[PDB]
């Protein structure tokens, strides 16, 4: 396919083209400012992934359970019958909640690992 | 709390607000230069931290032992009786030594890992 070629495909199918999208995120004052901003934006997403305990990965899962209040739609109903563009609207009011949980259930993990390594 | 809210507290309590501080580090020529510099500064710390074998972590530890000459001040009665601002001055003349050691006792680990993975 190519960049955004999977945009109309289901989430399951589209999850296999993440590499394509990631590689297209990176590369007179108005134009230079646009370039600096593209870098700041990129770095914020990378920082956020690092905070959540998910660094050099395109796909990673965590210990935060899905709350059914966050638009439960079965499971196969989402992955085999919805596009990412639609999913993005289904849970648009919950992303800040989810992100906060993702950060908290990392700090808990880092402390537990630090203590386990202290045992002899 | 909030950004720098734990600045006046002990190292112990302050260690639990690392996420808060990290998120506030990252986001006409002179204004643009300031933004570019902030990015270069950020990246240098991330590079350094990555070289030491500590990548997507706010807390990590290594095999470099603490030397008693580096401001040997107990542990429990100091860690929880001192702020980070104070600690920073207590060892300000040793950070270059420590940083050098952190890199050496990483390069050694990468070579050992590469050799172990070569055992059929």
């Amino acid at each position: 396919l190519g960049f955004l070629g999977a945009a109309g495909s289901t989430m399951g199918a589209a999850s296999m083209t993440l590499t394509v999208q990631a590689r297209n995120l990176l590369s007179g004052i108005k134009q230079l400012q646009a370039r600096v901003l593209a870098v700041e934006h990129y770095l914020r997403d990378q920082q956020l992934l690092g905070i959540w305990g998910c660094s050099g990965k395109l796909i990673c899962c965590t210990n935060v359970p899905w709350n059914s209040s966050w638009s439960n739609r079965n499971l196969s109903e989402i992955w085999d019958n919805m596009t990412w563009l639609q999913w993005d609207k289904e849970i648009s009011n919950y992303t800040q909640i989810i992100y906060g949980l993702l950060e908290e259930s990392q700090n808990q993990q880092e402390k537990n690992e630090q203590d386990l390594l202290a045992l002899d | 709390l909030g950004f720098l809210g734990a600045a006046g507290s002990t190292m112990g309590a302050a260690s639990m607000t690392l996420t808060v501080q990290a998120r506030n580090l990252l986001s006409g020529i002179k204004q643009l230069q300031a933004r570019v510099l902030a990015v270069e500064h950020y990246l240098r710390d991330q590079q350094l931290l990555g070289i030491w074998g500590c990548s997507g972590k706010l807390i990590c530890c290594t095999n470099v032992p603490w030397n008693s000459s580096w401001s040997n001040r107990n542990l429990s009665e100091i860690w929880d009786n001192m702020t980070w601002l104070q600690w920073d001055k207590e060892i300000s003349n040793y950070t270059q030594i420590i940083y050098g050691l952190l890199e050496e006792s990483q390069n050694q680990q990468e070579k050992n890992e590469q050799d172990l993975l070569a055992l059929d």
């Epitope: 537990n112 630090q114 203590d115 386990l116 | 429990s76």
Partner: antibody, heavy 123, light 109 residues
Framework: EVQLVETGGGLVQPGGSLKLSCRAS????????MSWVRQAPGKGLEWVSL????????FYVDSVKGRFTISRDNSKNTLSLQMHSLRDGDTAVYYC??????????????????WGQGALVTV | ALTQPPSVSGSPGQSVTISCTGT?????????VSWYQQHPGKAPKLMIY???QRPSGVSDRFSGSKSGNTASLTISGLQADDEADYYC???????????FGGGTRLTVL
């Protein structure tokens, strides 16, 4: 001044369950890791379980590993142990104690500092 | 299990030593071999910790040491007040965590 006081216990028929608990005062509950130690009638002392101070890490002796749960509540200053599938060999006095592992910032102990008097469990 | 079951005794005012023999890695590699004093019907109390330390409230009458894979507790100016069961225990290295010994009873007279 440490006050570790056990409750619960009593006679449970084999295959049954019970919950023990220990309330604590004097010392900041949240500052210490805690354990349960068993005193069988003629054995004296056996370690059973350990929980860290934040209540996130638990360890068990293999013999109760698939049966017992250890838990802490730092707002209540309460330690508890939920026992399931009890056997005759579990008859013992169960002691509440502070000590064992620590936080990695605090000169970990690996010994027990304080003991309660112990709840009696008969199966 | 750590081993120290034989009864122990001695005359008042005389020293007495209670041994604690381990296996290999438990008391050989870890300097975490505490001792407890157990009265017949009371909760035990800590006497010795690490290898040679005592908590406040424990007198100099109680001290101890370790060599090889064997540890010991020594009582100096032995009193009738020392008639208690004694137990040694040690850190096992994260797999079993703690091992208690088969303890022993001290008789003074």
């Amino acid at each position: 001044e440490v006050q570790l006081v056990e409750t619960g216990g009593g006679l449970v028929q084999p295959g049954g369950s019970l919950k023990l608990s220990c309330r604590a005062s004097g010392y900041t509950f949240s500052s210490f890791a805690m354990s349960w130690v068993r005193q069988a009638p003629g054995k004296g002392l056996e370690w059973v379980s350990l929980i860290n101070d934040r209540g996130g890490l638990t360890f068990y002796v293999d013999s109760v590993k698939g049966r017992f749960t250890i838990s802490r509540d730092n707002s209540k200053n309460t330690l508890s142990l939920q026992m399931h599938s009890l056997r005759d060999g579990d008859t013992a006095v169960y002691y509440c104690a502070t000590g064992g592992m620590s936080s990695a910032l605090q000169s970990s102990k690996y010994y027990f500092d304080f003991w309660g008097q112990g709840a009696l469990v008969t199966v | 299990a750590l081993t120290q079951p034989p009864s122990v005794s001695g005359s008042p005012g005389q020293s007495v030593t209670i041994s604690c023999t381990g296996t290999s890695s438990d008391i050989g590699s870890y300097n975490y071999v505490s001792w407890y004093q157990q009265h017949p019907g009371k909760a035990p109390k800590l006497m010795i910790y690490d290898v040679t330390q005592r908590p406040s409230g424990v007198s100099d009458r109680f001290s101890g040491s370790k060599s090889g894979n064997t540890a010991s507790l020594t009582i100096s100016g032995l009193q009738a007040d020392d008639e208690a069961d004694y137990y040694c225990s040690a850190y096992a290295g994260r797999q079993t965590f703690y091992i208690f010994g088969g303890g022993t009873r001290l008789t003074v007279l």
